[PDB]
Amino acid sequence: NNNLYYILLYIFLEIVFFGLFLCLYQLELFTGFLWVAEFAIVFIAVVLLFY
Amino acid sequence: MNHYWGSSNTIPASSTQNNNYFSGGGNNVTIRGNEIMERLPSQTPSQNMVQASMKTLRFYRKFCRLIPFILRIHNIGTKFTAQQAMINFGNYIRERNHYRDPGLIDHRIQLGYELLYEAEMHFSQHTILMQYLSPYNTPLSDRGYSYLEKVKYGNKSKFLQGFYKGNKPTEF
Amino acid sequence: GPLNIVFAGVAFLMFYENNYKKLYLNPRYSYTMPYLQSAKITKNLYEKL
Amino acid sequence: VLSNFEQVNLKNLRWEQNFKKLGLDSLDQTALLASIEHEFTILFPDGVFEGFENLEQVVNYILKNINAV
Amino acid sequence: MLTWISFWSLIFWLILIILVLKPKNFISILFMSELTWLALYCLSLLFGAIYCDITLLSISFFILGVAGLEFSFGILIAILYKNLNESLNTDLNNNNNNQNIFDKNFKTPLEKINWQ
Amino acid sequence: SRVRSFNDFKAAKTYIDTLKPKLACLYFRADWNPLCEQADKDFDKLSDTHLEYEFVKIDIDKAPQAKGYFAVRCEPEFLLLCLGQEMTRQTGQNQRNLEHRLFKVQEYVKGLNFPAGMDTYEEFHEQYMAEHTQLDKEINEWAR
Amino acid sequence: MNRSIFQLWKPESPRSNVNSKQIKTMNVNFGPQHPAAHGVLRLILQLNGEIAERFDPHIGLLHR
Amino acid sequence: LVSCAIFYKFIVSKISFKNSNYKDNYFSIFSKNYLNVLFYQYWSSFFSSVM
Amino acid sequence: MRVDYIVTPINAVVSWARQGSFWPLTFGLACCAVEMMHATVSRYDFDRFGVIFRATPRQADLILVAGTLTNKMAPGLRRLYEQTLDPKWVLSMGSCANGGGYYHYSYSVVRGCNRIIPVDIYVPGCPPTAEALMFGVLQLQKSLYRQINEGEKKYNKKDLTY
Amino acid sequence: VKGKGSIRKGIHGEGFGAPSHAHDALIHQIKQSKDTMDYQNITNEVAQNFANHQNNDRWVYERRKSNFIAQVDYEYFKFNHWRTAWRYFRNIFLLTAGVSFLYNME
Amino acid sequence: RSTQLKFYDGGNRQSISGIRATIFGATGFMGPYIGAALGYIGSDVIFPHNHVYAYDDYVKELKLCAGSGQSYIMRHFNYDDDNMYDMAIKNSNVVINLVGSRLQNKNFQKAAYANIHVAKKIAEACARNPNVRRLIHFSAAGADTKSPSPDLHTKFHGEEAVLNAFPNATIFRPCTVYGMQDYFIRHWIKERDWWYHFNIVTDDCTAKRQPILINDVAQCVLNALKLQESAGQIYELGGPHVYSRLEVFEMLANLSGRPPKLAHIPHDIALKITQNFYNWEFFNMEKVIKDKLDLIVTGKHKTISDLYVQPVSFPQGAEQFIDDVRYRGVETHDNLEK
Amino acid sequence: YVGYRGRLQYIADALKLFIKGIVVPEGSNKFWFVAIPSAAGAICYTFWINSMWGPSV
């Protein structure tokens, strides 16, 4: 995939799956932190695309 | 050039580049500009008929260059081609050929530029602006036509055709 | 087809074998299979359900 | 492009004739030049546009152009 | 179906390979670099849990910080791409013919070459 | 070889797809262009001269659909194909340029190498549709 | 309080890409059916980051 | 830390100079040296840091 | 026949709802607009009858033409009417909208908004008082409530509609 | 001229550039005509800008698009590509999970 | 009886043409166009209707076919009482019947009621009134006494009944009519938009069609009114060329750029499912039955050329109605500006 | 006046919003146009799991 928006969406889903692995392996706390941080980043990334 | 037609009033090719690298460019002639027009100054006065004729020719050239863009954005390409629209507007100009006052011609050129700008920026409606591009004695291409009065009044003169078809309602 | 029938047979045997080894040949002290294990109240730490 | 202008006969059309003797007045000349200009996706400079007298000069100019597509 | 250690080592190296593979758009490379940092984050947490080591969790949050600063730098560098006459697709910033691009075509800014 | 004339698009396409030529030259003609009279003679002469090509002439007036299928824009058109893939295209009437294009395509193809099993004939649109699902399909899924 | 005058205004120079408009301006219709446009005001507005740069007030939509 | 300091040093390099070339007014000249320096330093730092 | 057993009651629930929340479009021309805004404020509360104004035509149920319509505005009014979500109703308020009005003999005024879009009801005054505007809106609400079942179907021998 | 570098002032004219430098026609038009443009004059620079802009889209202009040929797809609802997947999956499952499971159960 | 009808067509909306017309069945697709063709020259038009939802745009916009004081909408029409028919055409010298079995309808009794009973009542009311000069009845091109479609069978029977009751009535049989709100192009667009991947076809698509634009049927009606020799004649109206259904699919695909995909379902399954299940606009027996039948000008009667109308070609006339649904693929940078 | 003394205003508003017929403009992505509201509703109908009404309730 070469569309920037779809690349961003798939990377967001990858972050979700990384957090899911951390949850399964029983590092729950680090799932809560990682997500929010990267979530903010993803948000900013979207704005960058808009520009 | 601080004008709507200035060479720097083109839409950038990309968000980080006006054109490809190593150079610049942009289309301002066959499409609309980047910024909106904010003022349209007066035409410089023409002292004789030569200058007025040159102004008319240049206005017609700009109109012809802008025809395909207007046809695309207004969805009127099936009613007539670009060349047909140019020919119809040329018929309009030819019907305005007898003019001989240069100031009147400058005024008309100003009005023509204004109407062209209105057409190219979706200010007017397509069914309204098509009155300047429509054929004079030919049906439009997007629909069928009736040739009943051609068959019945075949060789009859114009007077007889206008006599058989009245000029007022007949109930009253 | 025959191979589909064979696959269905193997799947059914797998399913039944798993269920049989969960129901029997297995201690039943925690509630895992509903409506097949007892839902009573246990007073001792080790009571069979 | 010239097919749209139906007052011009393409059968024995010789390209050295002036536009007027082909049946095109100034407005038709401007329309035809703009149509060719759109056809090849180029622009004619103001001196070049107003200096054209026949189709041979237009053909030569388009031949010498590298941006014509 | 694969052990987590081998899986995550392979995932990190595959992420690097895919980062190299994709067309050189600065924003895409920024996103893939962020993904690489996150893969390092996950691997460090996994080994910290396996070996009962508390420094690797620190590596996780330090990765978060380093990746954040790097992302800020990347955003600024892209906006710098805006002002300079450069394309976010670096393959369009040179005249080297590329068969991977359908429509790569550059010519000199001249209307004609010969006059006489 | 010898020119095969066609007035029906479906029959001509069936003939070409059954023949599966390695080198083909298609001459699309229409009656609006007065220069098409000389193009017929040029096509006949080049067809009898060259034997590595298959020469097929299509009347656009009697087979309008063919035009849309072959992206014909300005008749007369000479479309040179290798294994169904568009080698080149010429618009206008000039025998020397047509022969030069035929010679260039012939020599370049004769200097080519194809892996076994990947040198089969393909239809024309097959090249356009392959890139359509690669570029146009995804663009239309984002804008619309 | 330091000078921020250069961040405030951006002039234009002939054939200067960095001094020109490096963006497609947002040309919006502040048209008649707008709560802040009163009844008939059709104002062609050029916005660049929600900053009003160019005005084109079309009046006469209530000329009787 | 030192790599960030070196990046800061590279950023504050002087870009435009007062010279005796008076032919370049009213024309756009692209240098592109600043962007290349920043880009290559940035990505080399990224690769070294991750490894 | 049996479907009516479900359809006929439910119809009322469909009408009542759309009678209880009748949202007009925020659009006012000239000085019937001022009178309408008077009709919206606390002295005459449309919010009593569940009438609240929405600014976009996609969320509007009633188009309220309340001012003079010029030849410059007719395509815009046509587009605004076309871009409203169905079902929709149109109220014509004041003389300039019902007919030409005080500018019927002018060169730039549409001689009635019903030459461009269909009109469901007309309010005559110049300006019609907020009393009269509320009267017209209430009449339209009752009419559109009753409009779903006006006895179009015939009853068979079992007293069942079609 | 004070505060103007090497620009010199001649008779009847202040001068706009350093000596022996080429005079620019666009800047002449800018100075003489502040905002007045009688018509969009197409100079060499304007035509060159147009050519530069249109060269970016040369591939689209030269693209030869073929019209579609309609057909009635009789096999669309069979979903053959999903049956191949099913055959592959059941073969793999039987040859790996099935044999081992049956042997271990026995 | 007198078939003469003198009127002035050189006027505008506020003129007086001299035609007072009643149009039945104007709550469909033809209605607004026929009414506008009559009332745009200054005629008086009356629209009797009994429409399920009175607030639907199919009723309100009928008021736009003429000006204030010229167009009237008669509501709650019985379609069963002779008095209402007499009241509808009391002062009308022109009557047009557009009533016909709707596409959703699959009941034979309702089809006969729409195509035979109502037409017979209209013709009988016209015969009683001595001031009616011309009556134009709308039928179908493929109408036949042995048609598997109940619509075409009942339309042939209605032709017989109308010609029996009012021997000076004019019968129009359009082939298939397309426009902005039609069942040919709009249905194609909506079916492709809903079934995102395909258009459903239940046959080999070898049936023939002769599409004609809606703007040409109105001109045909006006020409027939102007021609006194068309009083007791049957006219079949179609486009210049005949296409198969597959060719129409391909032409619609090429005009818009959408790649065609025709998923095939066997005819008997579709017939059974449409027979035993509820039918609406986009799922009914009529589409399945008609897709195997040719609706073209057969040459047994007079054609559109006898009305001195030159219909527009299908590719040229259908292009403007698919401008919004054009495929958005690889385009130039200048195409971004709209 | 919706119900008795305005007791059913919210019910009437919700039912009318259900009744209104949505149209998707051309030039927009139909999938995204319909999918973003679905995701928004699914997200907003999750907040109630992040609620506390008494200790450990």
Ligand SMILES: CCCCCCCCCCCCCCCCCC(=O)OC[C@H](COP(=O)([O-])OCC[N+](C)(C)C)OC(=O)CCCCCCCCCCCCCCCCC
């Ligand atoms: C893409 C734009 C930038 C995205 C930035 C990051 C966004 C993060 C998520 C924000 C919310 C919006 C996403 C969800 C809705 C859209 C789904 C999507 O993107 O599908 C794309 C994907 C892919 O898009 P596609 O199918 O159009 O792409 C085709 C392939 N290419 C890219 C080549 C054109 O969609 C599908 O695979 C099919 C549709 C599946 C939709 C399944 C979810 C629907 C919504 C359910 C409710 C939401 C989830 C549950 C609630 C939330 C958790 C508690």
Ligand SMILES: NC(=O)C1=CN([C@@H]2O[C@H](COP(=O)(O)OP(=O)(O)OC[C@H]3O[C@@H](n4cnc5c(N)ncnc54)[C@H](OP(=O)(O)O)[C@@H]3O)[C@@H](O)[C@H]2O)C=CC1
């Ligand atoms: N459009 C086409 O493609 C072609 C159409 N025709 C015929 O031309 C005529 C007009 O066409 P068109 O407008 O498109 O068709 P429609 O199906 O859209 O309209 C049918 C009209 O008849 C009315 N009607 C239907 N059933 C009954 C009934 N039982 N009692 C009373 N009125 C009824 C409908 O009103 P309501 O349902 O609201 O009561 C509506 O006004 C029809 O007879 C049609 O079959 C012929 C050839 C081609």
Ligand code: SF4
């Ligand atoms: S009808 Fe009269 S009072 Fe009302 S808006 Fe018109 S001018 Fe004002």
Ligand SMILES: [Zn+2]
């Ligand atoms: Zn019978």
